[PDB]
Amino acid sequence: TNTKGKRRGTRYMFSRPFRKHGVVPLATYMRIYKKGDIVDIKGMGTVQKGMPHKCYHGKTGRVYNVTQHAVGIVVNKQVKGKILAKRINVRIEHIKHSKSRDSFLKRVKENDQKKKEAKEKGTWVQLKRQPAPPREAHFVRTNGKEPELLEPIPYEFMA
């Protein structure tokens, strides 16, 4: 049977990457988390106060509280059969903004631009995304030179 210890099996998780030990660069500390900001937790060995538990490493979640130098953050955790949205207080240093959401915001901004325009025109434009379709009919010009013949090569034992 295994030990229930908090930091069991975080020999590699909470360990600063190669040649990135030492001082935590300050941008980290000086960027603002509001309420409802989606945020991806990722523990960090240096700062040991306010570490999140190993289960939430990798997990992303939304911010619901903002204390002085920590941020309450609702995350989903699975537990055998049931997923539990649960709220953890992680000190800033173990937290980044999840870029996941930003590509969506860009796309909404592009749709709003393309909805204001093309209304006075009349031409309705494709707003939805669409999966990468089959790659269309097209000509291939073997310009002058013929194609190159490829024999499979005869075996030989190298080692």
């Binding site: 619901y64 509280n65 903002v66 204390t67 309450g72 989903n76 699975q78 055998k80 059969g81 049931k82 997923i83 539990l84 949205a85 709220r87």
Partner: peptide
Amino acid sequence: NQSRKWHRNGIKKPRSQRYESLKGVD
């Protein structure tokens, strides 16, 4: 057999309401 047991009745994501509580706010 546990995975199979869990998935009979879903593994339902936690029901997100609008207007959640202010319990545990500074």
